[PDB]
Design an enzyme around this catalytic site. Structure first.
Site, PDB file in Angstrom:
ATOM      1  N   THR A  89       0.822  -1.206   0.000  1.00 11.23           N
ATOM      2  CA  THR A  89       0.000   0.000   0.000  1.00 11.23           C
ATOM      3  C   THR A  89       0.859   1.259   0.000  1.00 11.23           C
ATOM      4  O   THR A  89       0.579   2.208  -0.743  1.00 11.23           O
ATOM      5  CB  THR A  89      -0.933  -0.006   1.209  1.00 11.23           C
ATOM      6  OG1 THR A  89      -1.424  -1.333   1.431  1.00 11.23           O
ATOM      7  CG2 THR A  89      -2.104   0.939   0.989  1.00 11.23           C
ATOM      8  N   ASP A 125      -6.910  -0.676  -3.061  1.00 12.33           N
ATOM      9  CA  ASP A 125      -6.043  -1.545  -2.285  1.00 12.33           C
ATOM     10  C   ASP A 125      -6.862  -2.637  -1.614  1.00 12.33           C
ATOM     11  O   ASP A 125      -8.017  -2.428  -1.230  1.00 12.33           O
ATOM     12  CB  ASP A 125      -5.261  -0.751  -1.235  1.00 12.33           C
ATOM     13  CG  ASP A 125      -6.151  -0.183  -0.154  1.00 12.33           C
ATOM     14  OD1 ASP A 125      -7.369  -0.052  -0.393  1.00 12.33           O
ATOM     15  OD2 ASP A 125      -5.633   0.130   0.936  1.00 12.33           O
ATOM     16  N   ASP A 126      -6.246  -3.811  -1.478  1.00  9.61           N
ATOM     17  CA  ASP A 126      -6.902  -4.996  -0.932  1.00  9.61           C
ATOM     18  C   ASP A 126      -8.137  -5.351  -1.764  1.00  9.61           C
ATOM     19  O   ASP A 126      -9.278  -5.334  -1.299  1.00  9.61           O
ATOM     20  CB  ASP A 126      -7.262  -4.786   0.543  1.00  9.61           C
ATOM     21  CG  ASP A 126      -6.175  -5.267   1.480  1.00  9.61           C
ATOM     22  OD1 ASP A 126      -4.994  -5.255   1.074  1.00  9.61           O
ATOM     23  OD2 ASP A 126      -6.501  -5.663   2.618  1.00  9.61           O
ATOM     24  N   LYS A 161     -12.536  -1.380 -17.717  1.00  9.64           N
ATOM     25  CA  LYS A 161     -12.342  -1.246 -19.159  1.00  9.64           C
ATOM     26  C   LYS A 161     -13.449  -0.390 -19.770  1.00  9.64           C
ATOM     27  O   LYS A 161     -14.012  -0.712 -20.816  1.00  9.64           O
ATOM     28  CB  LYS A 161     -12.285  -2.615 -19.834  1.00  9.64           C
ATOM     29  CG  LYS A 161     -13.544  -3.455 -19.661  1.00  9.64           C
ATOM     30  CD  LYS A 161     -13.682  -4.487 -20.768  1.00  9.64           C
ATOM     31  CE  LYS A 161     -12.699  -5.627 -20.589  1.00  9.64           C
ATOM     32  NZ  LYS A 161     -12.729  -6.571 -21.738  1.00  9.64           N
ATOM     33  N   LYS A 218       7.232  -5.205   6.983  1.00 10.35           N
ATOM     34  CA  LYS A 218       6.352  -4.748   8.053  1.00 10.35           C
ATOM     35  C   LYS A 218       6.500  -5.597   9.310  1.00 10.35           C
ATOM     36  O   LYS A 218       6.212  -5.120  10.413  1.00 10.35           O
ATOM     37  CB  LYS A 218       4.899  -4.753   7.579  1.00 10.35           C
ATOM     38  CG  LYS A 218       3.894  -4.369   8.655  1.00 10.35           C
ATOM     39  CD  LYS A 218       2.547  -3.999   8.050  1.00 10.35           C
ATOM     40  CE  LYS A 218       1.446  -3.986   9.101  1.00 10.35           C
ATOM     41  NZ  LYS A 218       0.110  -3.634   8.536  1.00 10.35           N
TER      42      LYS A 218
HETATM   43  N1  LIG Z   1      10.554   0.582   1.584  1.00  9.97           N
HETATM   44  C1  LIG Z   1       9.376   0.371   2.180  1.00  9.97           C
HETATM   45  N2  LIG Z   1       8.404  -0.255   1.481  1.00  9.97           N
HETATM   46  C2  LIG Z   1       7.225  -0.470   2.070  1.00  9.97           C
HETATM   47  N3  LIG Z   1       6.835  -0.147   3.305  1.00  9.97           N
HETATM   48  C3  LIG Z   1       7.814   0.471   3.973  1.00  9.97           C
HETATM   49  C4  LIG Z   1       9.083   0.762   3.500  1.00  9.97           C
HETATM   50  N4  LIG Z   1       9.832   1.408   4.472  1.00  9.97           N
HETATM   51  C5  LIG Z   1       9.013   1.491   5.491  1.00  9.97           C
HETATM   52  N5  LIG Z   1       7.778   0.944   5.261  1.00  9.97           N
HETATM   53  C6  LIG Z   1       6.661   0.884   6.196  1.00  9.97           C
HETATM   54  O1  LIG Z   1       6.033  -0.365   6.007  1.00  9.97           O
HETATM   55  C7  LIG Z   1       4.619  -0.247   6.283  1.00  9.97           C
HETATM   56  C8  LIG Z   1       3.894  -0.679   5.038  1.00  9.97           C
HETATM   57  O2  LIG Z   1       2.573  -1.120   5.416  1.00  9.97           O
HETATM   58  P1  LIG Z   1       1.546  -1.649   4.339  1.00  9.97           P
HETATM   59  O3  LIG Z   1       0.153  -1.352   4.728  1.00  9.97           O
HETATM   60  O4  LIG Z   1       1.962  -1.109   2.974  1.00  9.97           O
HETATM   61  O5  LIG Z   1       1.822  -3.210   4.322  1.00  9.97           O
HETATM   62  P2  LIG Z   1       1.309  -4.467   3.492  1.00  9.97           P
HETATM   63  O6  LIG Z   1       2.183  -5.644   3.663  1.00  9.97           O
HETATM   64  O7  LIG Z   1       1.101  -4.002   2.052  1.00  9.97           O
HETATM   65  O8  LIG Z   1      -0.124  -4.699   4.122  1.00  9.97           O
HETATM   66  P3  LIG Z   1      -1.339  -5.725   4.038  1.00  9.97           P
HETATM   67  O9  LIG Z   1      -0.675  -7.103   4.031  1.00  9.97           O
HETATM   68  O10 LIG Z   1      -2.088  -5.540   5.359  1.00  9.97           O
HETATM   69  O11 LIG Z   1      -2.169  -5.453   2.831  1.00  9.97           O
HETATM   70  C9  LIG Z   1       4.393   1.240   6.555  1.00  9.97           C
HETATM   71  O12 LIG Z   1       4.638   1.423   7.943  1.00  9.97           O
HETATM   72  C10 LIG Z   1       5.577   1.890   5.844  1.00  9.97           C
HETATM   73  O13 LIG Z   1       5.913   3.040   6.604  1.00  9.97           O
HETATM   74 MG   LIG Z   2      -2.284  -3.557   2.765  1.00  8.13          MG
END
Ligand SMILES: Nc1ncnc2c1ncn2[C@@H]1O[C@H](COP(=O)(O)OP(=O)(O)OP(=O)(O)O)[C@@H](O)[C@H]1O
Ligand SMILES: [Mg+2]
Ligand SMILES: Nc1ncnc2c1ncn2[C@@H]1O[C@H](COP(=O)(O)OP(=O)(O)O)[C@@H](O)[C@H]1O
EC number: 3.6.4.6
Lengths: 106, 518
Positions: free
Chosen positions: B328, B381-382, B409, B486
Site C-alpha cells: 500500500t 487496495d486490498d 475497461k 512490516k
Molecule cells: N521501503 C518500504 N516499502 C514499504 N513499506 C515500507 C518501506 N519502508 C518502510 N515501510 C513501512 O512499512 C509499512 C507498510 O505497510 P503496508 O500497509 O503497505 O503493508 P502491506 O504488507 O502491504 O499490508 P497488508 O498485508 O495488510 O495489505 C508502513 O509502515 C511503511 O511506513
Molecule cells: Mg495492505
C-alpha cells in the site's frame, strides 16, 4: 448605543420543532417559529439583543436557527472529570463543616 | 444600447465561474436585443424561467443580484418561499395574485414596451410535492402558462432538492434552462479571502507577516460564510489577547491567531488532503536494496505514458507480492510522485458493515467524480477484501466483481485520461476468476531474501549496532532469511522491550523461530 437585553428561552425545543409536516391542522407551531426567525434576523437590524437557548437534546431543533447568522457558538456541557467533582462536593458540603456537623473520619 | 458584453464580474468582487456568462448572455441577447416588432412577426417566445440549485452557502443569492443588476431590469422583489404558502388555501390565491398584479399594472399602463421585472423565489422544492401542493403549483403555473400572457416575467428561483420539484415546472416554456453552483474553488477561495483581507487592509491594521496564499492553501471547502466566520474568529481572538494584556495603538493581527482560530473555532466542511499520505505512509519509505527502485521506475514510466498520448486513454496496473511486504505504501508513493489534479484512495476501512449494493454505489460515485477533471489517478487496495473472500466454500460477492470488471475497461468521456492502480496479495485467485486478464501489466514486490540486505536495512534503521551488529552478522551469514518489511518493525520493537543486556538473544530467537522457509 445603549446596553444589551438578554432573553433566556428555557426548553427552546418545545416551541421550535421541525417545520416539515407536523401532520396537524392549523400552523401555530410553524407560525411561531417563522415569526421568531423573522424577528431575530430580518430587514431591520437589531444589535442590543442576545438569546441563550438551552435544550436537553439538540436533535429536535429546527435547522434554520443553527445555521450561521441565527445562532452560532454552540457549546456542550459535559460531566466533571476529577477536580470539578471535588469542587462540587466541597460546595455542597461547606455548610455542615461550617457548623461542625461532619465527623473527622470523613 | 444593443449589447453589454462587459465581464469585470469576476474581478468586480464575486468569483463565481467564467463559463456560464456565454450561455446566459447569448440567450438574453437573442431574446431581447432585436427590435420587438420583428420578434412579433417571427412569432418567437421570450425566455422566462431560471433555477439556480445546489447546496446552500455557495453564493447563489449574490449571483441572482448580479444578473438582475447587469440586466437592464427594474428593482427586484423576493420572498423566502413557504412564507407565501400559508397553511390555509386561498391565502395562496390572493397572495399569489397580488405579486403578479404588481407587474401587470405596470405592463398594462406602459403597454407592450416596458422593462423587465425580476421576481426572485427561494425553496420551491418545499411547495412542490396534502392537496394544497397541487393547487398552489397550478396557481403559480397559471400566469406563466400564457392565459395571463405576461411577457415581462424574469423568475430566477433557488432550491436544494431537484428530485422534489415537479418536472412540469421545467417543461419547455416553464423553466427551460438550469444551473448549479459548486465548491468555493481553490482559486476562488483565494480570491474571496483576498477581497476580505483587502477590506481589512483598508486601514492597514493587518500585520505584514500574514499571507493570503498559505492561508488559502490550508483551508479546504470553506464557503464564503465560513471564511467570513474564520475572519471574525481571528479578530475576536486578537481582541481577547489584547484585553488580557498603548497596546491599542499597537494592535496587529498575527498568523498564530489565524491558526488558533482555524484549529479551535471554525469547523471545516470538506478537508482530507493531510490525512491520506500521513496515515498510509506512516514511517516513510526506506531503501533497502535494488528491488525497491525498479517498482518506482516502472511507476514513473507508466505515469509518463498515460500523461501524453492518444489511442490509449486508459491504463491499468497491478502490484502483487507476498503479505506483509508493504504494498500500500509503495503504491501511495507512486501516486504522490506525479502531480495529477485529482487523486483519491478507495480502501475498505471506511465501509465496515456495508452490504454489496452500498459498496457498488460508493465505488461508482468515486469513479464518476474522477471522470470530471482533465486527468486523474485512482488507487484500489486490498482487492481481495472489497470482494470479501473466504477460502472455505469458497464464498464471495458476485455483484462487486462484475462492477469492477466492467469499470476497469470503460473509457472516459471524450478527450480525458485516467490511471488506475490496484493492490493484491493473492494472484492465483484473481487468475482463476479471469480478472487478471483486464489489467494491462503487473509489478512484483519482493521480500528481503539475503543477509546483506537485512544488515543494510537494520543499520539504516539504526537501533542495533557495534558488537550487536557484528554478532548478528556473524550469526545470519551463511543462512537463508525470508521476512517481510512490516514484520521487521514489530519484531525489533518487541525485542527492544527486554533488559538492556538481554536484547540480541530475544531478537535472534524470534527471527529464527519465524521466517520459515520460502
Ligand atoms: N521501503 C518500504 N516499502 C514499504 N513499506 C515500507 C518501506 N519502508 C518502510 N515501510 C513501512 O512499512 C509499512 C507498510 O505497510 P503496508 O500497509 O503497505 O503493508 P502491506 O504488507 O502491504 O499490508 P497488508 O498485508 O495488510 O495489505 C508502513 O509502515 C511503511 O511506513
Ligand atoms: Mg495492505
Ligand atoms: N463567490 C463569492 N464571493 C464573495 N463572497 C461569497 C461568495 N460566495 C459566497 N460568499 C459569501 O457567503 C455568503 C453567501 O450567502 P447566500 O449565498 O446568501 O446563502 P445561500 O448560498 O444559502 O443562498 C455571503 O455572505 C457571501 O459574503
Amino acid at each position: 448605543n445603549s446596553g444589551l437585553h438578554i432573553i433566556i428561552f428555557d426548553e427552546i425545543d418545545a416551541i421550535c420543532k421541525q417545520r416539515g409536516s407536523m401532520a396537524g391542522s392549523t400552523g401555530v407551531h410553524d407560525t411561531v417559529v417563522n415569526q421568531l426567525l423573522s424577528k431575530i434576523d430580518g430587514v431591520e437590524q437589531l444589535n442590543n439583543i442576545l438569546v441563550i437557548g438551552m435544550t436537553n437534546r439538540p436533535d429536535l431543533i429546527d435547522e434554520a436557527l443553527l445555521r450561521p447568522g441565527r445562532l452560532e457558538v454552540k457549546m456542550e456541557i459535559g460531566l466533571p472529570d476529577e477536580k470539578g467533582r471535588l469542587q462540587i462536593l466541597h460546595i455542597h458540603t461547606a455548610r455542615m463543616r461550617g457548623h461542625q456537623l461532619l465527623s473527622a473520619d470523613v | 444600447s444593443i449589447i453589454n458584453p462587459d465581464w469585470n464580474f469576476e474581478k468586480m468582487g464575486i468569483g463565481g465561474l467564467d463559463k456560464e456568462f456565454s450561455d446566459i448572455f447569448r440567450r438574453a441577447f437573442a431574446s431581447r436585443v432585436f427590435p420587438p416588432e420583428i420578434v412579433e412577426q417571427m412569432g418567437c417566445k421570450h425566455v422566462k424561467g431560471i433555477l439556480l440549485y445546489g447546496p446552500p452557502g455557495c453564493g447563489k443569492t449574490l449571483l441572482a443580484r448580479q444578473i438582475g443588476k447587469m440586466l437592464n431590469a427594474r428593482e427586484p422583489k423576493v420572498v423566502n418561499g413557504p412564507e407565501i404558502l400559508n397553511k390555509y388555501v386561498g391565502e395562496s390565491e390572493a397572495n399569489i395574485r397580488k405579486l403578479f398584479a404588481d407587474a401587470e399594472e405596470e405592463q398594462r399602463r406602459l403597454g407592450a414596451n416596458s422593462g423587465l421585472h425580476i421576481i426572485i423565489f427561494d425553496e420551491i422544492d418545499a411547495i412542490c410535492k396534502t392537496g394544497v401542493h397541487d393547487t398552489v403549483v397550478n396557481q403559480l403555473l397559471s400566469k406563466i402558462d400564457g392565459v395571463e400572457q405576461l411577457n415581462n416575467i424574469l423568475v430566477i428561483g433557488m432550491t436544494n432538492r431537484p428530485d422534489l420539484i415537479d418536472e412540469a415546472l421545467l417543461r419547455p416554456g416553464r423553466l427551460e434552462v438550469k444551473m448549479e453552483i459548486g465548491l468555493p474553488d481553490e482559486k476562488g477561495r483565494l480570491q474571496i479571502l483576498h477581497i476580505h483581507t483587502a477590506r481589512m487592509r483598508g486601514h492597514q491594521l493587518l500585520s505584514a507577516d500574514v499571507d493570503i496564499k498559505e492561508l488559502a492553501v490550508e483551508t479546504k471547502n470553506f464557503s464564503g460564510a465560513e471564511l467570513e466566520g474564520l475572519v471574525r474568529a481571528a479578530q475576536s481572538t486578537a481582541m481577547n489577547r489584547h484585553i488580557k494584556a498603548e497596546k491599542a495603538e499597537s494592535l496587529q493581527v498575527t498568523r498564530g491567531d489565524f491558526l488558533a482560530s482555524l484549529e479551535n473555532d471554525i469547523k471545516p466542511a470538506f478537508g482530507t488532503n493531510q490525512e491520506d499520505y500521513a496515515s498510509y505512509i506512516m514511517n516513510g519509505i526506506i531503501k533497502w536494496g535494488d528491488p525497491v527502485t525498479r517498482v518506482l521506475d516502472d511507476g514513473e514510466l507508466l505515469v509518463q505514458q498515460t500523461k501524453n498520448s492518444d489511442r490509449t486513454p486508459l491504463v491499468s496496473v497491478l502490484l502483487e507480492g507476498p503479505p506483509h511486504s508493504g504494498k500500500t505504501a509503495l503504491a501511495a508513493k507512486i501516486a504522490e510522485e506525479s502531480n495529477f489534479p485529482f487523486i483519491k484512495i478507495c480502501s475498505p476501512d471506511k465501509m465496515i458493515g456495508f452490504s454489496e449494493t452500498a459498496k457498488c454505489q460508493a465505488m461508482k460515485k468515486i469513479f464518476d467524480d474522477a471522470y470530471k477533471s482533465q486527468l486523474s489517478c485512482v488507487v484500489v487496495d486490498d482487492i481481495e477484501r472489497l470482494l470479501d473472500y473466504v477460502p472455505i466454500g469458497p464464498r464471495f460477492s458476485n455483484l462487486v466483481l462484475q462492477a469492477l470488471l466492467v469499470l476497469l475497461k470503460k473509457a472516459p468521456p471524450q478527450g480525458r485520461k485516467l490511471l488506475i492502480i490496484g493492490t493484491t496479495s493473492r494472484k492465483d485467485v484473481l487468475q482463476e476468476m479471469e480478472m487478471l486478464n483486464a489489467f494491462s501489466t503487473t509489478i512484483h514486490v519482493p521480500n528481503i531474501a539475503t543477509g546483506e540486505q537485512l544488515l543494510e536495512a537494520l543499520e539504516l534503521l539504526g537501533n542495533f549496532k557495534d558488537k550487536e551488529r557484528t554478532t548478528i552478522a556473524q550469526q545470519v551469514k551463511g543462512k537463508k532469511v525470508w521476512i517481510g518489511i512490516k514484520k521487521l518493525l514489530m519484531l525489533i520493537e518487541m525485542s527492544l522491550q527486554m533488559d538492556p543486556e538481554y536484547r540480541v538473544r530475544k531478537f535472534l530467537a524470534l527471527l529464527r523461530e519465524e521466517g520459515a522457509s520460502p
